[PDB]
Amino acid sequence: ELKVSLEERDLWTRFKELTNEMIVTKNGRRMFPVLKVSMSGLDPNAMYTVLLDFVAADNHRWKYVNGEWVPGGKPEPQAPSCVYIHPDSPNFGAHWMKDPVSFSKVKLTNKMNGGGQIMLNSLHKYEPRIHIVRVGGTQRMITSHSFPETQFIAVTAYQNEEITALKIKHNPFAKAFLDAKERN
Amino acid sequence: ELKVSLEERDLWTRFKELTNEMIVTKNGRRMFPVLKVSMSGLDPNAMYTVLLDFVAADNHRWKYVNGEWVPGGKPEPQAPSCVYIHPDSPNFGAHWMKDPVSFSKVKLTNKMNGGGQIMLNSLHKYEPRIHIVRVGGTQRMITSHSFPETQFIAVTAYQNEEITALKIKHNPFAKAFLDAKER
DNA sequence: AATTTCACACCTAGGTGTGAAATT
DNA sequence: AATTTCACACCTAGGTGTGAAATT
DSSP: OOEEEETTHHHHHHHHHTOOEEEOBTTOEEOSSOOEEEEEOSOTTSEEEEEEEEEESSSOEEEEETTEEEEESSOOOOOOOOOEEOTTOSEEHHHHHHSOEEOTTOEEESSOOTTTOEEOOSSSEEEEEEEEEEESSSSOOEEEEEOGGGOEEEESSOOOHHHHHHHHHHOGGGHHHHHHHHHO | OOEEEETTHHHHHHHHHHOOEEEOBTTOEEOSSOOEEEEESSOTTSEEEEEEEEEEEEEEEEEEOSSSEEEESOOOOOOOOOOEEOTTOSEEHHHHHHSOEEOTTOEEESSOOTTTOEEOOTTEEEEEEEEEEETTOOSSSOEEEEOGGGOEEEESSOOOHHHHHHHHHHOGGGHHHHHHHHO
8 A cells, every 4th residue: 555656757857867956035936847746545534644845865065067066065964854734734545645746835945934935955955755644543654755856956046057948848937938939 | 612703894794785796607706705704712623624605595586676686586495505615624723713714716606517616596695604514523513604794696797886896996806997997 | 256136027827897799 | 678608808916037236
């Protein structure tokens, strides 16, 4: 039982191969691609809460040198980001398994604004991590699952234009720019 | 302990006074004003599901005659509407009491399209009804709450221009029309 | 020098009353 | 006649990368 799969695996893979970059802003920025996963093997009638946090992919600050991401400086330990409760929580296993679970509303930021936005440090790699926590009862049951293909480097401005082109070609809110290309 | 209060009582009252009309479309229409309520006296740790449905205010088909809504023809039985599950359900009492509970996403239609939209019959009077159900509770722990100032007549097109004017004045999505008056 | 901020043009998404036209 | 439908301009609401400007 208990299986959690990554939706849109192909698009994520393409981002990984280019070394994915996620914008983080003073006000909070949404992720792209949107983290979507499928879960099964949950007690359909049990109550569960889904959580999302980000763990440091390594202890290096990265820098873009000669068109390539490169680690540098004194390596430092990085604490896992604060947790983001998926908005559908708490909810039945049946609900969680009906349709794919999407984290489309989570906002990433570089500030410590307690508005339910996940603070991350730019120029550091992160890997999203999902937690399914059983609600109620007296026994604890908690599962975690990370996806290597969702690793990215938090940034305040894109560096690799190959990524920017992938964002533009796939994110609806960036259609203006895509349209600009399809005619010029 | 338990108390469920209507938010924007003033605006609803004004609509009531003019005999509120609610547009219903083949695709579903949102309510205006938006139905919001403050609830308190729930077990902060208990799990609750909030529901919304509409009950027929009477057995008459209404018609707008000489600038007035009047009942006519023969009465019939108007069954209660299907139920709408507040999107935040199921959830803790603490969550329900923290911030006003709003039903802004409920769509009203005059077709039997199974899309989570509530079907109503136009030219009929209805009154929204909210139910708080304790998950695992008894049956007595299920309370109901209706507010007579939220009564309205379902319509496919406004009849009383005084209502149209209040809708325009207060619904942000109708600003184009309001602006068109303030110059 | 390197990285963050910011006003802005441009989209996506989707809620409104209009009023003519179509339907009952 | 009485009521419903429908394309349309015009809004609200808010997500994007751009590139100059400000900060470190």
